[PDB]
Design a protein around this ligand. Structure first.
Ligand code: HEM
Length: 124
């Protein structure tokens, strides 16, 4: 069974994407990460969801509409240090605790996001 399947499919991917930004947008420690996002969040909420649907084994909605992830490259316009990586993970940890009831999948998702996040870092 895929992460997409275990999390309830579309509604599960949507809820993660939305909870992530919901928390990012109000939590103090992540203001800096939040401030890199020009408002409103409508499009990035939708795009991140599209990404999650395929990264979890549902429809590649991202690769259908925007092409391959190339996430490291796609983040190269921004300055991303350790500090911002940790802010991003802090938000996604909090999200996955609330959204993923399977504790194995949850720890699996945290580690795999944790790695992707570290991969984006481009300032040391
Ligand atoms: C330190 C880590 C990260 C930082 C600071 C960061 C920051 C950003 C920012 C500022 C954008 C621009 C979106 C906008 O306002 O339109 C963006 C886009 C995006 N981020 Fe991240 N991000 C990070 C890590 C990640 C990770 C780990 C993933 C996926 C697992 C991810 C997926 C995306 C996606 C899919 C987009 C949309 C890209 C596009 O439309 O071409 N990001 N990110």
């Amino acid at each position: 069974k895929t992460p997409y399947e275990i999390l309830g499919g579309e509604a599960g991917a949507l809820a993660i994407a939305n909870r992530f930004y919901d928390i990012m947008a109000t939590d103090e420690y992540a203001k800096p990460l939040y401030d890199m996002h020009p408002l409103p969040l409508d499009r990035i909420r939708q795009v991140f969801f599209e990404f999650l649907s395929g990264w979890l084994g549902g429809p590649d909605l991202f690769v259908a509409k925007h092409g391959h992830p190339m996430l490291r490259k796609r983040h190269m316009p921004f300055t991303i240090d350790q500090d911002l990586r940790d802010q991003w993970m802090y938000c996604m940890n909090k999200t996955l605790d609330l959204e993923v009831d399977n504790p194995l999948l949850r720890e699996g998702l945290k580690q795999s996001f944790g790695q992707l996040a570290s991969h984006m870092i481009n300032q040391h």
